[PDB]
């Protein structure tokens, strides 16, 4: 059975807060197609010979 995710629990209370003291500059990628290959066909040359 696939592991749905890493189990975690955050300590919540009604008078406590958590504030970062440091940062981290991260770089991520993302690939997106734009245009495929333009194609054309010949009717008679294909249907006939």
């Amino acid at each position: 059975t696939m592991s749905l995710g890493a189990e975690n629990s955050v300590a919540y209370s009604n008078n406590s807060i958590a504030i970062p003291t440091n940062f981290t500059i991260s770089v991520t990628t993302e690939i997106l197609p734009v245009s495929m290959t333009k194609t054309s066909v010949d009717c008679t040359m294909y249907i006939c010979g």
């Binding site: 054309s40 010949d42 040359m45 010979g49």
Partner: protein, 49 residues
């Protein structure tokens, strides 16, 4: 068939007669005389704009 006949380097086996492409159309053929081996290629063609 209509096409251009050129010298071919294909090493036919002695019993082999034709040569077929992906579309099962005779690509390389053996002439009855001289037992020569040829290539059959459609003549130059294309689109006009």
């Amino acid at each position: 068939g209509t096409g251009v006949l050129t010298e071919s380097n294909k090493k036919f086996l002695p019993f082999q007669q034709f040569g077929r492409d992906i579309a099962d159309t005779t690509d390389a053929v053996r002439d009855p005389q001289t037992l020569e081996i040829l290539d059959i290629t459609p003549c130059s063609f294309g689109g006009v704009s």
